[PDB]
Curated annotation (Swiss-Prot), chain A:
The gene is PIGR. The chain holds residues 374 to 491 of 764 of the full protein. This is Secretory component. Residues 1-85 form the Ig-like V-type domain. Disulfide bonds join 12-22. Glycans are attached at residues 48, 96.
Swiss-Prot record, chain B:
GO terms for molecular function: antigen binding; IgA binding; immunoglobulin receptor binding; protein homodimerization activity; protein-macromolecule adaptor activity. Disulfide bonds join 10-96, 69-89, 104-129. Glycans are attached at residue 46. GO terms for cellular component: blood microparticle; dimeric IgA immunoglobulin complex; extracellular exosome; extracellular region; extracellular space; monomeric IgA immunoglobulin complex; pentameric IgM immunoglobulin complex; secretory dimeric IgA immunoglobulin complex. GO terms for biological process: adaptive immune response; antibacterial humoral response; glomerular filtration; humoral immune response; immune response; innate immune response; positive regulation of respiratory burst; protein-containing complex assembly. Keywords: Disulfide bond, Glycoprotein, Pyrrolidone carboxylic acid, Secreted, Signal. The gene is JCHAIN. This is Immunoglobulin J chain. It comes from the Eukaryota. Part of the secretory IgA (sIgA) complex that consists of two, four or five IgA monomers, and two additional non-Ig polypeptides, namely the JCHAIN and the secretory component (the proteolytic product of PIGR). Part of the secretory IgM (sIgM) complex that consists of five IgM monomers, and two additional non-Ig polypeptides, namely the JCHAIN and the secretory component (the proteolytic product of PIGR). JCHAIN-containing IgM interacts (via CH4 domain) with FCRM (via Ig-like domain). Serves to link two monomer units of either IgM or IgA. In the case of IgM, the J chain-joined dimer is a nucleating unit for the IgM pentamer, and in the case of IgA it induces dimers and/or larger polymers. It also helps to bind these immunoglobulins to secretory component. Its main location: secreted. It is found in: Secreted.
Swiss-Prot record, chains C, D:
The chain holds residues 110 to 325 of 391 of the full protein. Residues 3-98, 106-208 form the Ig-like domain. This is Immunoglobulin heavy constant alpha 2. GO terms for cellular component: blood microparticle; extracellular exosome; extracellular region; extracellular space; IgA immunoglobulin complex; immunoglobulin complex, circulating; monomeric IgA immunoglobulin complex; plasma membrane. GO terms for molecular function: antigen binding. Glycans are attached at residues 22, 96. Keywords: Adaptive immunity, Cell membrane, Disulfide bond, Glycoprotein, Immunity, Immunoglobulin, Immunoglobulin domain, Membrane, Repeat, Secreted, Transmembrane, Transmembrane helix. Disulfide bonds join 1-58, 25-82, 128-191. Constant region of immunoglobulin heavy chains. Immunoglobulins, also known as antibodies, are membrane-bound or secreted glycoproteins produced by B lymphocytes. In the recognition phase of humoral immunity, the membrane-bound immunoglobulins serve as receptors which, upon binding of a specific antigen, trigger the clonal expansion and differentiation of B lymphocytes into immunoglobulins-secreting plasma cells. Secreted immunoglobulins mediate the effector phase of humoral immunity, which results in the elimination of bound antigens. One of its GO terms (biological process) is immune response. It is found in: Cell membrane. It is a single-pass type I membrane protein. The lineage of its organism: Eukaryota, Metazoa, Chordata, Craniata, Vertebrata. Immunoglobulins are composed of two identical heavy chains and two identical light chains; disulfide-linked. Monomeric or polymeric. Part of the secretory IgA (sIgA) complex that consists of two, four or five IgA monomers, and two additional non-Ig polypeptides, namely the JCHAIN and the secretory component (the proteolytic product of PIGR).
Length: 118, 132, 231, 231
């Protein structure tokens, strides 16, 4: 709701084994669940009615139902389901690179022609 | 009476549909279509007061009520493509026969306050025009 | 036994759903296609990779080279002018390609099943018809609910020119056979047609049993002296 | 080029409308020109007539062997073996044919125009459809009233085969656009399909207006002093 835009935002994953539970994966005050170090981020764009959260580096373990929380007076809780299908990523970078102790670096990142306008 | 096809509020028309699947002759069944029209007996032709006589001719084109003039999203292979939905969606312009409970309708009238005239604004539907 | 060089456009499938508008410059009928070079008038990704000399009618050689590039300049209206530097002759031959002009946009219609198929209660036929379009390329797919049906379940014909009421326009057709049980239950079907003259490149029509020609019609006219508001 | 001998079957367009079904056993690929002539296996009352040759890729030859003896012994069940002999490798080639069995009938549907076209006062469009027949030979005509329309006012596609389980079947379409003044007058139109497995060799289907007109229409006028509508 737009009239409580100064709130705190959460991102919890449905466990669903004993009774149902949301372990908190990330928040707005800068705390990450340590298993998700490097592949989770909550962002504030576009604002004014919405916000985004980005989950990459997908394996087939991540197929689950996800919930979003805020500490506002009114509580909309919305459910998103992530599936996993067959294919390969559009962007391309190598495997996790190394670097020298004290010398320059360069890392490419491809993108196909659908992403040329962007 | 169970699934709604259109509910149009500029002309106040509503069209529903239902399959009346009976038991005798278990191979044939009918399809019913209900149309409801509410006719306003005291509105003007343009919705602004002094213009024209009260409207006396009401015309409903069912090919225009039923159309969908807006894009939509389709997933073809592994993609999200934006499609249109009709062959007739070029140019609001449609004349409205009734009001609509969720929209203001205001007018402009000149009056006198000693010297100059003014540009008084006037509510035509007073329930919908509070500034909130 | 004779040279003749042609230029083929990009396709429609890879340029609408994607944008990877590769080109191809190839002639067939040479004499000594072993060492040769090719010309393309601009070049950015200059790795125009060679290929094997696939034989043709009565066994003469054929060149093979692909020009890359994608669908922003072909949409903007550029030009490409590939010609040859053959090992078999003395003065080359020229051909060019551009985006097509004076384009009309199609009209899509979906036709419900015929009446006598609904009595026999095995399988019914849908018919998608697309009409009046000046370039000769088109795409036709099918959807059930929101799921794309795979391509082996429907039959689509080719594109041919209709009788000429002044200017040359074309036509295409397609059919799909589904089960009578789930047409009577209430599933919905769609035919999605994509041609480049359309403004958003695609258009869709959806049809189900409830939104069709009825057998019963009830009409109610209510005269309201109270108000003119329509709640 | 390369030598090959094949042969044809008589065309349906004058097998059902006449009795001049000329067969053909033509060979193609000959180092020298025509010096060959033929021999047919039955004794059908005439012998073959040979025509002047034609040109092909780089110098290949082809002549024809027409057997005009069609007093219909073909659907009677004969076999009609051909035999040619050329100044080439000394093997006089052979060729078979049979008029096959395992046939099926087609099922013909004639569809009414879509609604958007009707509400626009221009040309309206009609659709014929035939499907399910076992050999891929068929004819499609049209009729307005009783006069047959000339064959350059309608478009018809090829005959392709439809995906199913095992038993191979084929399909074919055709369209025809008439003026809306002709439709709303009350003139009828007909599709007509010729096929070999039909018992009387043809099938009609006729459409006009009043086709799917509804059976019931209720009109109720609720005057004020009685208004009670619901949300
Ligand atoms: C139905 O009646 C209304 C009321 O007149 C018509 O709307 C308005 O018509 C006037 C005609 O003088 C237009 O005048 C404009 O006024 C504005 C003031 O905001 C001024 O900035 C302009 O330069 C011009 O003088 C006005 O465009 C128009 N629309 C509004 C106020 O929204 C209406 O056209 C009538 N409908 C029909 C179908 O006749
Ligand atoms: C239509 O033409 C085809 C060939 O173009 C004919 O089919 C062939 O017929 C021959 C003899 O009738 C078959 O040869 C067989 O060889 C075996 C040896 O394994 C032998 O044991 C048999 O007694 C017989 O001689 C051959 O299999 C067959 N098929 C081919 C070549 O694919 C056919 O006869 C012609 N139609 C008519 C009506 O004659
Ligand atoms: C990407 O490769 C690097 C290379 O190891 C991994 O990053 C860390 O590497 C150090 C030293 O090799 C280890 O001590 C850490 O345990 C690694 N981090 C983690 C989270 O395991 C990194 O794991 C690789 N990326 C992924 C997604 O596995
Ligand atoms: C493309 O090659 C053709 C060769 O067939 C060139 O031909 C001319 O095309 C223009 C149309 O753009 C005509 O107005 C001329 O009359 C054509 N010339 C002749 C002799 O017929 C053409 O020059 C090439 N395209 C460009 C852009 O130069
Ligand atoms: C937020 O969205 C509403 C919706 O119309 C808009 O009126 C408002 O101006 C927007 N606020 C900002 C800061 O963009």
């Amino acid at each position: 709701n737009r009239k409580e835009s100064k709130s705190i935002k959460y991102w919890c994953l449905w466990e669903g084994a004993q009774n149902g539970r949301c372990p908190l994966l990330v928040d707005s005050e800068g705390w990450v669940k340590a298993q998700y170090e490097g592949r989770l981020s909550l962002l504030e764009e576009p604002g004014n009615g919405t916000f985004t959260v980005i989950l990459n580096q997908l394996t087939s373990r991540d197929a689950g139902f996800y919930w979003c929380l805020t500490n506002g007076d009114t509580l909309w809780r919305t459910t998103v389901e992530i599936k996993i299908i067959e294919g390969e990523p559009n962007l391309k970078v190598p495997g996790n690179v190394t670097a020298v102790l004290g010398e320059t670096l360069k890392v490419p990142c491809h993108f196909p022609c659908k992403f040329s306008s962007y | 009476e169970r699934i709604v096809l259109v509910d149009n509020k500029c002309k106040c028309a509503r069209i529903t549909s239902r399959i009346i699947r009976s038991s005798e002759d278990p191979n044939e069944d009918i399809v019913e279509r209900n149309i409801r029209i509410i006719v306003p007996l005291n509105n003007r032709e343009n919705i602004s007061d002094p213009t024209s006589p009260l409207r006396t001719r009401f015309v409903y084109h069912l090919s225009d009520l039923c159309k969908k003039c807006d894009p939509t999203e389709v997933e073809l292979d592994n993609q999200i493509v934006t499609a249109t939905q009709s062959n007739i969606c070029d140019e609001a312009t449609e004349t409205c026969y009734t009001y609509d409970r969720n929209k203001c309708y205001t007018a402009v009238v000149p009056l006198v306050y000693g010297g100059e005239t003014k540009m008084v604004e006037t509510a035509l539907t007073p329930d919908a025009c509070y500034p909130d | 036994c004779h040279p003749r060089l042609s230029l083929h456009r990009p396709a429609l499938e890879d340029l609408l759903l994607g944008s990877e508008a590769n080109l191809t410059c190839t002639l067939t009928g040479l004499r000594d296609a072993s060492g040769a070079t090719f010309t393309w008038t601009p070049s950015s990704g200059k790795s125009a990779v060679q290929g094997p000399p696939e034989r043709d009618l009565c066994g003469c050689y054929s060149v093979s080279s692909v020009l890359p590039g994608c669908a922003q300049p072909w949409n903007h209206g550029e030009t490409f002018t590939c010609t040859a530097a053959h090992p078999e002759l003395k003065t080359p031959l020229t051909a060019n390609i551009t985006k097509s002009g004076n384009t009309f946009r199609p009209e899509v219609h979906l036709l419900p099943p015929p009446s006598e198929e609904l009595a026999l209660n095995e399988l019914v036929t849908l018919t998608c018809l697309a009409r009046g379009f000046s370039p000769k390329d088109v795409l036709v797919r099918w959807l059930q609910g929101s799921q794309e049906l795979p391509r082996e379940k429907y039959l689509t014909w080719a594109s041919r020119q209709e009788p000429s009421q002044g200017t040359t326009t074309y036509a295409v057709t397609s059919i799909l056979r589904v089960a009578a049980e789930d047409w009577k239950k209430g599933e919905t079907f769609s035919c999605m047609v994509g041609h480049e003259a359309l403004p958003l490149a695609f258009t869709q029509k959806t049809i189900d049993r409830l939104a069709g020609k009825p057998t019963h019609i009830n009409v109610s006219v209510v005269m309201a002296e109270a108000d003119g508001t329509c709640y």
